[PDB]
């Protein structure tokens, strides 16, 4: 299986480690491996230092000075798998170091306080929370900076805006009124900005001349000079305009917060907020926000340049200073680390809220730790984040790729409340900046469009929540092997060129060059080229980047394909596509699917269970294998070993294959032999037909493991117990249970079988007065006990593979209150490809398997080789996805050559390469035929007739050469299986990669007769051996109503659910062989009479002539 690779653009730098977003976000979050000595703070340590100097001074007695030194974690409670087996979180313990001082002598320092537990991250990038693997998405929002907006309402001029956040961080808006009045909005407050400038220290003289020289608009500033004659008098003047009945003397009081400390700051000193100000305007920014503590009289870092630029924009050209919202340099991405640290900060301040109150009830000296510290608020906060937050979710780990794509997903809809389901128009739209930064394809179908979108393959978040796509500098017309990851805003400064631009080492070729100055598509010259694209993968996500002939595919069905790959199911006979993009290897690599040698070496031992190697440095290492493990959405993820005893190996070489990996290539489905023709109505509107042969050679067959669980809760009536001797059960039903009442391993279990025997006592509680005595009187413990066991639900199981008991004397387990033990039984099934299943190619051909033909009567080549699958051609013209056709063609050639290929995305394989390879193949599919003893079939001739008459072959030629022609065009003769006559027209066939999706027909087919019914509302449900009924919706009612279906509708609203007396009459009467007892009165009606009567309404029923009518069945009488 030799790989030819097509197209050579030398993609100069490899992909980022595609998990880096989570791993490094949660590295930067918690400086954990590094000493607290280490100089950078941001994340946990900064969230610490932010709150930490806790000054509760003088309202009676104080001198509390509790400060921060160090913090540490080190030791996780339990192993990872231990954290999953028992339902525990994978965490480290947090204890920071502290010293509270006094107004008097000395300072007690209690080293450690394990205030709160803090989860950890796995190598691969996920978390373990409730026992359950979870993942934190990222988030988008408006980056905290200085922005300039056209006046929404008024058509003319602009309004500034100073945006901070964390939420606590005040919002200021600086608009200039044609009236001249420079208005200024905080908390809905509108006033001449000047009052504020004065508070800073700006006198009306230096202001107008040195700022507003260039605009005459400066005269809109200086109007109220009457008030602006007095400095600190202004601070009070302003103090007025918040009016709770304040102390008008309290000087630096509100101005303290919007100066320095708690409110507008960005994370840390240097680049946190300063970049967004520094770039859009201004020059520098000492301090986090405009502030002063050392002199008391205040300095604005900010307020002058902001207004200066509102001038600079209102009048003429510094550059062109209107700011775009959706531009991804004026929008920001929230890594995991930061999100968790935001919650960690608000938790820490819940603690700082309680401890102030402990500064009051505190004795005098006796305070050192637990007086001040409880884990409770911080713990509750972090825990609340990880297990209840909108942005944590169950790991999408159907297959490796799925989980990977989840890890690098990106959401708009913030649990902080960033965006809501109502609005979406311009929000959802792709924006110029999403180039190289965000996938234009990866957004999902239906409501969630453009809100959740995954980031580009090459994109990577820098120190501050900004996406940065690379580019390579080019020098005059000389291209560099040097690469710069550029900011969105920074990107627009330059003239960037396309990667599909011709080369000669470092040199452009074409005088006409394709290139993009900010946004626009521009034709340009070689000299003018400042930067060039790295490769065309950078434009799209990872999924989207695994489609090989994407170039020829409408983005709409390309999205379908990208998303489809998410839901592929890992197949026992998994295969890596005959034709790949090349990323498959790196994807199984970066996902932690497989197992790779760490050094050169040799192999020592190879179990199904583990592998042991002997390295160069002297080491010998055991790697155990994930033998057969269950995944969040059912799919089996075992690792298989691929190496032998006494085989040498190379660093980075693979040792065992992941869930859906084939010799270390992403294997999501198979390569089947497709013919692409219509069939006797069996591949209709998208349906798909199959050769039974796929089942005999276990192809589209996948394992699946469900997992059942039951508790032995403890009761008012007495404790429940897990045992074999249930009462009213036939010996037959008990055969497969072990002595403890748990079903034994490797037994075949049918819906209705017992998995776990459990016996509860008779309910209605322990009747002390008479029975208590009876207990003494008669064989104490001779009471009564009913059976409440665990049955395989309708739906099914298969065979028991694994049991887990979590018993009392709980040896490392957090059992719920009341819970005595729990039992889980794991049940697997091999799921062959039944009819009703879903299959789809990479190019987005959703289809159902609709017919399984026996090998015998389905379309076969001249040589008796039949096709495996039969796709309707009618699926192609609508859904412009000619990629799959080119897959099929290349596949055809790869079948006879016995080789696989890599067509890089936009550096594809071109038409004639294809053709040459096909020629190569014809001399194998046919060259043999002639020597073997066999020329043409009379059928072959008879179809070549119609072929040249149709214009496919060129008349006058030998059938050999005609068949060559017909081959190269993608098509070959095909015989009907069932007639043996040929198909009157040649037909394209080839190898197609096609996969089996999560949507099998187990989760899907229900059918209710009769059963349970809910207690308040009497519409049915299910439990023991009964499904639940389908909802008959209002529209379904409308449907019936349009028709005359009066009775059918009544039934649907009566006998078939709700009306009890009626439905019972109905069943019994069916058993008789009677029609059905519809009438009497409807439930709803008598119930709405009495329910109406419960408020004092007299609702009475009348005859034709207005007369009384007893609706209540002769039961109304007193």
């Amino acid at each position: 299986m030799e790989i030819k690779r097509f197209g050579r653009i030398r993609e100069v730098i490899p992909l980022p480690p595609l998990t880096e977003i989570q791993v490094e976000s949660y590295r930067r979050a918690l400086q954990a491996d590094v000493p607290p000595e280490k100089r950078e703070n941001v994340g946990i340590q900064a969230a610490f230092r932010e709150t930490f100097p806790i000054e509760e001074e003088d309202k009676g007695k104080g001198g509390l000075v509790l400060d921060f030194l160090e913090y540490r974690l080190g030791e996780p409670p339990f192993p990872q798998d231990e954290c999953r087996e028992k339902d525990l979180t994978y965490q480290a313990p947090l204890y920071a170091r502290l010293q509270l001082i006094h107004k008097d002598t000395g300072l007690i320092k209690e080293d450690e306080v394990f205030l709160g537990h803090i989860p950890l991250m796995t190598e691969d990038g996920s978390f373990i929370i409730n026992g359950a693997d979870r993942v934190i998405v990222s988030q988008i929002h408006r980056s905290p900076g200085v922005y300039f907006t056209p006046d929404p309402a008024r058509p003319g001029r602009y309004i500034a805006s100073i945006i901070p956040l964390p939420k606590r961080g005040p919002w200021i808006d600086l608009e200039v009124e044609p009236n001249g009045v420079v208005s200024m909005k905080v908390n809905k407050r509108k006033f001449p900005l000047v009052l504020l400038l004065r508070v800073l220290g700006y006198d009306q003289e230096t202001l107008a001349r040195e700022l507003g020289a260039y605009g005459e608009l400066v005269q809109g500033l200086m109007d109220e000079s009457v008030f602006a004659m007095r400095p600190e008098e202004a601070l009070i003047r302003l103090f007025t305009l918040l009016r709770p009945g304040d102390p008008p003397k309290r000087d630096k009081a509100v101005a303290y917060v919007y100066g320095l400390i708690a409110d507008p700051r960005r994370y840390d000193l240097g680049e946190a907020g300063r970049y967004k100000a520094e770039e859009k305007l201004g020059i520098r920014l000492s301090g986090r926000t405009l502030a002063r503590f050392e002199d008391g009289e205040f300095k604005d870092e900010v307020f002058l340049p902001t207004l200066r630029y509102l001038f600079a924009l209102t009048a003429g050209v510094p550059g062109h200073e209107v700011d775009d919202i959706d531009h991804l340099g004026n929008r920001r991405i929230r890594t995991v680390g930061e999100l968790m640290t935001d919650q960690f900060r608000v938790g820490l301040a819940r603690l700082a809220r309680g401890v102030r109150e402990r500064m009051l009830m505190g004795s005098e000296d006796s305070l050192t730790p637990a007086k001040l510290v409880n884990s409770r608020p911080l713990e509750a906060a972090i825990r609340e984040f990880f297990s209840r937050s909108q942005l944590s979710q169950f790991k999408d780990e159907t297959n490796p790729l799925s989980s990977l794509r989840h890890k690098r997903r990106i959401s708009a809809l913030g649990p902080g409340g960033l965006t809501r389901e109502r609005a979406g128009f311009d929000v959802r739209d792709v924006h110029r900046t999403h180039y190289g930064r965000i996938c234009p394809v990866e957004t999902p179908e239906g409501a969630n469009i453009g809100l959740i979108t995954s980031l580009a393959a090459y994109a990577r978040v820098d120190e501050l929540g900004f996406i940065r796509t690379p580019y390579r500098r080019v020098v005059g017309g000389v291209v560099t092997d040097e690469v710069v990851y550029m900011t969105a805003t920074e990107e627009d400064r330059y003239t960037i060129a396309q990667a599909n631009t011709p080369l000669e080492g470092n040199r452009i070729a074409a005088e006409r060059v394709v290139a993009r100055r900010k946004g626009e598509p521009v034709i340009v010259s070689p000299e003018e080229v400042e930067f060039m694209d790295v490769s065309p993968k950078q434009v799209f996500s990872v999924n989207t980047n695994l489609i090989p002939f994407l170039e020829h595919d409408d983005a709409n069905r390309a999205l379908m394909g990208s998303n489809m790959q998410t839901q592929a199911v890992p197949l026992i006979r998994a295969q890596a596509p005959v034709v790949m993009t090349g990323l498959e290897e790196r994807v199984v690599r970066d996902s932690l699917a497989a197992l790779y040698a760490e050094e050169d070496g040799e192999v020592a031992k190879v179990d199904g269970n583990r592998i042991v190697v002997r390295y160069e440095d002297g080491r010998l290492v055991e790697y155990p294998l994930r033998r057969f493990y269950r995944s969040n959405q059912g799919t089996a993820l075992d690792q298989r070993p691929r190496v032998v005893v006494g085989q040498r190996v190379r660093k980075g070489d693979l040792l065992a294959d992941g869930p859906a990996s084939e010799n270390g290539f992403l294997a999501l489905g198979q390569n089947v032999l497709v013919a692409i023709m219509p069939f006797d109505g069996y591949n209709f509107e998208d349906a798909i037909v199959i050769s039974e042969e796929l089942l005999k050679r276990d192809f589209y067959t996948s394992i699946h493991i469900e997992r059942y669980e039951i508790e032995a809760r403890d009761t008012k009536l007495g404790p429940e117990r897990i045992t074999r001797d249930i009462p009213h059960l036939s010996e037959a039903a008990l055969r497969d249970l072990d002595e403890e009442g748990v079903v034994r391993i490797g037994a075949e279990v049918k819906p209705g079988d017992i998995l776990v025997g459990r016996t509860s006592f008779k309910g209605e509680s322990e009747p002390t007065p008479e029975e208590r005595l009876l207990r003494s009187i008669f064989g104490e413990k001779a009471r009564d006990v009913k059976d409440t066991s665990l049955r395989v639900p309708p739906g099914e199981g298969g065979i028991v593979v694994r049991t887990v008991r979590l018993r009392r004397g709980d040896p490392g387990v957090e059992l719920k209150p009341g819970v005595r033990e729990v039992v889980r039984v794991y049940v697997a099934q091999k799921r062959k490809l039944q009819v009703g299943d879903k299959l789809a190619n990479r190019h987005g051909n959703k289809g159902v398997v609709a017919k399984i033909l026996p090998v015998e009567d389905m379309p076969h080549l001249p040589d008796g080789t039949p096709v495996d699958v039969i796709l309707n051609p009618l699926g192609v013209p609508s859904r412009m996805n000619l990629g799959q056709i080119l897959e099929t063609h290349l596949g055809l050639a790869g079948y006879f050559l016995g080789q696989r290929y890599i067509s890089p995305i936009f550096d594809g394989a071109k038409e004639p390469e294809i053709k040459e390879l096909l020629a190569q193949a014809f001399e194998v599919y046919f060259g043999k035929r002639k020597g073997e003893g066999f020329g043409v079939d009379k059928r072959e001739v008879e179809v070549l007739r119609r072929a040249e008459k149709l214009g496919l072959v060129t008349p006058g030629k030998t059938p050999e050469e005609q068949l060559k022609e017909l081959f190269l065009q993608g098509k070959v003769v095909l015989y009907d299986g069932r007639t043996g006559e040929p198909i009157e027209g040649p037909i394209v066939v080839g190898q197609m990669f096609i996969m089996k999706l999560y949507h099998m027909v187990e989760d899907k087919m229900h059918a209710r007769s009769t059963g349970p019914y809910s207690l308040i509302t009497q519409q049915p449900l299910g439990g023991k051996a009964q499904f639940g009924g389908q909802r008959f919706g209002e529209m379904e009612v409308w449907a019936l109503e349009a028709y005359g279906a009066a009775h059918t509708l009544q039934e649907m609203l009566t006998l078939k659910s709700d009306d009890i007396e009626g439905r019972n009459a109905a069943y019994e009467a069916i058993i008789k062989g009677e029609d059905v007892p519809e009438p009497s009165v409807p439930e709803s009606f008598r119930v709405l009479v009495k329910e109406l009567q419960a408020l004092a309404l007299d609702v009475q029923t009348l005859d034709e002539k207005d007369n009384p009518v007893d609706i209540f069945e002769g039961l109304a009488s007193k």
Partner: protein, 37 residues
């Protein structure tokens, strides 16, 4: 649904509703006008 005259007791109301509502799913956001009418 036939081409003979309408049969008494046919719920023409609902039928007309449906028959106008269903194609609404094909109206670009068009529809706002159908509402505005």
């Amino acid at each position: 649904s036939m081409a003979r005259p309408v049969s008494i007791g046919e719920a023409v109301g609902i039928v007309a509703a449906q028959s106008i509502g269903e194609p609404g799913t094909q109206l670009t956001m068009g529809l706002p006008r159908v509402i505005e009418l």
